[PDB]
Paper text:
Many NLR proteins nucleate the “inflammasome”—a large macromolecular complex that triggers inflammatory cell death and cytokine secretion in response to microbial or danger-associated ligands. Like many other supramolecular assemblies in the human innate immune system, the inflammasome complex relies on homotypic and heterotypic interactions between the death domains (DDs) to initiate, amplify, and propagate pyroptotic signaling. Inflammasome sensor NLRs can be grouped into two categories based on their DDs: PYRIN domain (PYD) and caspase activation and recruitment domain ([name]), both domains were found to form filamentous complexes to initiate the inflammasome formation. Extending this analysis, we also found that specific type II interface motifs directly dictate the compatibility of heterotypic pairwise [name]-[name] interactions among [name], [name], [name], ASC, and CASP1.
To extend these results beyond [name] and [name] and test the predictive power of our model, we examined a third [name]-containing NLR sensor, [name]. To unambiguously assign the Type II interface residues of human [name]-[name], we determined its filament structure at 3.3 Å using cryo-EM. The final polished structure closely agrees with previously published findings. Interestingly, unlike [name]-[name] and [name]-[name], the strong density bridge in the Type II interface is absent within [name]-[name] filaments. The Type IIb tyrosine residue (Tyr78) is folded backward toward the hydrophobic core and does not participate in intermolecular Type II interaction. Instead, two nearby small residues, Asn77 and Gln82, come forward to form a class of Type II junction that is more flexible than that of [name] and [name]. Molecular docking predicted that [name] Type IIb surface would be structurally compatible with both ASC-[name] and CASP1-[name]. This was validated using the in vitro EMSA assay (lanes 6–7 in both panels) and in 293 T cells. Overexpressed [name]-[name] nucleated the formation of both ASC-GFP and CASP1 C285G-GFP specks, as well as ASC-[name]-GFP and CASP1-[name]-GFP filaments at similar levels. The versatility of human [name]-[name] is in agreement with previous studies on murine [name].
Author numbering:
A (entry chain E), B (entry chain D), C (entry chain K), D (entry chain A), E (entry chain B), F (entry chain H), ...: 1 to 85
Write the structure that this text describes.
């Protein structure tokens, strides 16, 4: 998805860890990620690094995994998604 | 197997180390690889190089070792395998 | 011991760090490991990597070091050992 | 660009990793670098080595890629760029 | 092809190994090179020597193999190809 | 032995250096080779050349030295030996 | 065979050593050459000299040995053989 | 010493780097090795290669240097030495 | 200094990282080390490796740099220095 | 310069890679070395070999290039230069 | 040209291979040398021998080919050319 | 000197390259060898060949050059020299 690439400069800045901890779960429910990638992402200290791991690990998993991330991104932390349009 | 050769341009890009660490184990269980090749593959830094070592070391071990790699590739990181068809 | 090899696919998944921190000590008491290997294993972040280091470092120390690991594995975290049979 | 060459003695000293992690992203957005060079640069330990890789990999990519690096260097870590003139 | 010959003074200087590792793959997919030439080229240390081996091994394989190299050179490391015109 | 000659086209292709490093040792234990031939074989870069040196240096040492090579070849890297029959 | 004679001006130029190392093997399997001629050809430095020795040593061994050389030349380094027609 | 030669098949497999890092020091104290050989051995990645360098560099330094290696081998990693008898 | 060499077997074991972090600073104040060596030593995980880097980097800087290290070693972590005599 | 020749026995021993990485840069700024010699020197593993390459490549570039090396050697790692007088 | 003859005692000593690898290329661009002479010169081990081949093969190719060699010698490795006047 | 001749059977076996790299330097300091012989000896792969070149090149340079070689042989790698008496 181009929408993630073009705004990934701002996505690694104003996202927040507290919403990452939820997006990773909603992704784990839909059988996109296994447990090891959650244990690797969720253990980092600075949330910007987790943003790097998630953004870089979703652009690798085709384009169908982008839509799920976008819905799970507009459910939690909606003001950012509405602000970015 | 032709399926690996024809898609090996994309397999060395969107694979990921975290799933390689499991594929190498599932291969080690079935007596395909010995320990030294695991110690050689698992010590590299960039995951693309590990993808090169695995892809280049499976095309050498006949064609029966391809099917096991394909099963262990469709168990972990299924969205890539489903996307590639 | 074959019992570790045949189930090492599941041992690197459902083990847990909190029991590794005890198994390493019970091994350190019986003069199997020295301190440097404990400092190397206990400093890793993801517990699966510690499981890899322990499982790969016990299959190297003969077969007598397997029984001690099995006893220290059935004392703490007994439901896993009972479930695996 | 001569400005980078003449001050590259000081650019590999007072730069810092935390700003490199942003410069690499702002470069990745503008289709200058691909992902593999980011995975190679961002994995090094000492920030001076990352400064060597970036400075040596930009002087090779013509002169138009120097101006973008200079803008992305004057946005983040402005006091260094203002101090160097 | 004359375009490679006339600019091969600059192609062995500002190319980089990280893009060679991809060009060799995209060439290996199209049945141009076999595995042994990849094992000979990819094992050299200084990237300039790999540039010598590739540039000297493509001018020998007719002119039809030049176009594929040029496309695979404008996909990865595009700023160099655009700068060289 | 005819079995080595008739399949030596495929033995110099799908063998691998990592198993050569063990076969040379298992040969060195049984007083077949001295150290200088190990220092000559183990220093080459491309594994195919080491395959040439070993295959060409065993057909010279009678036929009794073939059986040891075959056993040491079916212990490590068994899938190749089983595939070749 | 006239096809080798008429194009031997270009065969001693764009052939390459890396394919000679395979053609000599595929010839040695079919009991065409003995080992001493392989030890004579494979020890030369410039690949053009090996091309001279091989091309001059095949035109002497009748015409039936030309067809095998042509097949082994169209298996490895096919783009040259297809380009030369 | 024959004891090292006859069991060097197993010594290059189940030794481990973590004990090599200590054996090299205990050897460096007794003026057996100088610093350059320590810098050559300690920089390798796979521990099996370090085992090769140490085992091959001790069989060259007479037989008196074997006893020190055996004592320093039975102090650290004692279960291996006791298992090997 | 001979005192460091003769006890370097025990200095790389019972030293500790928490005192290394202070010795490196007290050395940096007296213009013995520059910043890059501090960034190289302080980034290692196991404290024994830092002990190796410091002990091996002081025996290279003459003998006058030994006395400062000994004073800075008897200020912090005094019981070890008093125990070693 | 005689001062380098007469002390080159000790300069290839107690120098260190960490200061070589800076001397090569300060030399690269003053248009003494080009990039290829830096890529050749900086890629070696053991620092003693880099000391050999630098010391042997400076005694070839006249005597005016010795003074610059001496200044850049007395700026970083001053205690060695002061100890050697 | 007399300038090469009178100083060829010093040109075969302080030149270096790393600059020869570039001078041969800059000569190959201007249609002075063909590929076979580059394959003959570039394959020698000691750089002094390459200096002998180049210096002896340029004094044979008239005097117009000397000026190009002098320019390509003053572009790379300038301190030698400036020192020799 | 007879001592070198009578033990040169064992000197070409248990010497090692790592000490040759120092003996050649200590010889170069005392104006015994020039640089070209160092470039000839130090470029060989198998250390036994370097032992052949050094041992055969010292028996030619009178007998006074033997004592220097013997001292430089008893400084580095002392256990061999003490074992050989």
């Amino acid at each position: 998805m181009n929408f993630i690439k073009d705004n990934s400069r701002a996505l690694i800045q104003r996202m927040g860890m507290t919403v990452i901890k939820q997006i990773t779960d909603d992704l784990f429910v839909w059988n996109v990620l296994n447990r090891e990638e959650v244990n690797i992402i969720c253990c980092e200290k600075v949330e910007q690094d987790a943003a790097r791991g998630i953004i870089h690990m979703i652009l690798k998993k085709g384009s169908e995994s982008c839509n799920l991330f976008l819905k799970s991104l507009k459910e939690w932390n909606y003001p950012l998604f509405q602000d970015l349009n």
